[PDB]
Design a protein around this ligand. Structure first.
Ligand code: PF4
Ligand code: MG
Ligand code: ZN
Length: 303
């Protein structure tokens, strides 16, 4: 539709409530970023539908979130033409679509405390190693190898782009990554031709996309927070059932402190994330501007 063709280019686009339109929205973004003659369409469509099937009906880390995160990546890539290679752009959009595959609405910390079998298999970045494993499993289904026209070397290359990008959505990793990037910026040593540096920038891009609810317009941001807390509070209930006091953010008894919690997150995570991103990629400034506006809104709630 014309309104979507126009507004999909905005960083603060919302993908709407019609689920059956989201696959086509993703294909549109893939074709604009990577070209039409670079995925076989029927195979891409089959892949997308299997990815959708492997997302769960949870409040926040669901299929809608996957496509939303992919859209943020599309907007970053569209506004930074010439920086990322064709393979990187394909890899990143696919990584975003797949990055929360099979998410149950629980953190890595909860999996560890539960003694879930995934935590024995993957001791660090547990869910994220699982998300990548699931991505590979879907790619290996008959007729689902969207990368079948790549050489073996390019296939290995894009799967590694995807693995690194999915792992980078473990927010635990963000703090250290952003610290290193900020030092590289301050000292003028960031080198986008250096693969280690380049991987870090991509990781920050993945964080920025994953957190992008705080870069929407206030009505969208506020509504999305309801879904984020529905998951967090259910996890806190589950902590209590294990006999463990949950942290305030997961404890529904502490919900009156939501605005203070939001301030904490914007100050410690979101504003620094988008500030560092804008320093490296100036055209991403609208994400930072929107984030600052939402911080002001939470401050107003407190007032
Ligand atoms: C964008 O979505 C959210 C942002 C922040 C939170 C959040 N809520 C609380 C609460 C404390 C008490 C009652 S609620 N704390 C946070 C929070 C503070 C700091 C963070 O990272 C450093 C991370 C999280 C929840 C959702
Ligand atoms: Mg995740
Ligand atoms: Zn996510």
């Amino acid at each position: 539709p014309a309104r979507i063709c126009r507004d999909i280019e905005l960083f603060h686009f919302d993908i709407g409530p019609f689920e059956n339109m989201w696959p086509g929205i993703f294909v549109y973004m893939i074709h604009r970023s990577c070209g039409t003659s670079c995925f076989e369409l029927e195979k891409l469509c089959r892949f997308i539908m299997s990815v959708k099937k492997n997302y769960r009906r949870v409040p926040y880390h669901n299929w809608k979130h996957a496509v939303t995160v992919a859209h943020c990546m599309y907007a970053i890539l569209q506004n930074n033409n010439g920086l990322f290679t064709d393979l990187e752009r394909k890899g990143l959009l696919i990584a975003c679509l797949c990055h929360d595959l099979d998410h149950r609405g629980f953190s890595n910390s909860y999996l560890q405390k539960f003694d879930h079998p995934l935590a024995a298999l993957y001791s660090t970045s547990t869910m994220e190693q699982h998300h990548f494993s699931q991505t590979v499993s879907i790619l290996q289904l008959e007729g689902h190898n969207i990368f079948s026209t790549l050489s073996s070397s390019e296939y290995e290359q894009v799967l590694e782009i995807i693995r690194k990008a999915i792992i980078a959505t473990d927010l635990a990793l963000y703090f250290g990554n952003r610290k290193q990037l900020e030092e590289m910026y301050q000292t003028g040593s960031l080198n986008l031709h250096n693969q280690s540096h380049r991987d870090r920038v991509i990781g920050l891009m993945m964080t920025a996309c994953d957190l992008c609810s705080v870069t929407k317009l206030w009505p969208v941001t506020k509504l999305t927070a309801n879904d984020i807390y529905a998951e967090f509070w259910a996890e806190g209930d589950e902590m209590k059932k294990l006999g463990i006091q949950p942290i305030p953010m997961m404890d529904r008894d502490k919900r009156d402190e939501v605005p203070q919690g939001q301030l904490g997150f914007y100050n410690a995570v979101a504003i620094p994330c988008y500030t560092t991103l804008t320093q490296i990629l100036p055209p991403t400034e609208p994400l930072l501007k929107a984030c600052r506006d939402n911080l002001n809104q939470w401050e107003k709630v407190i007032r």
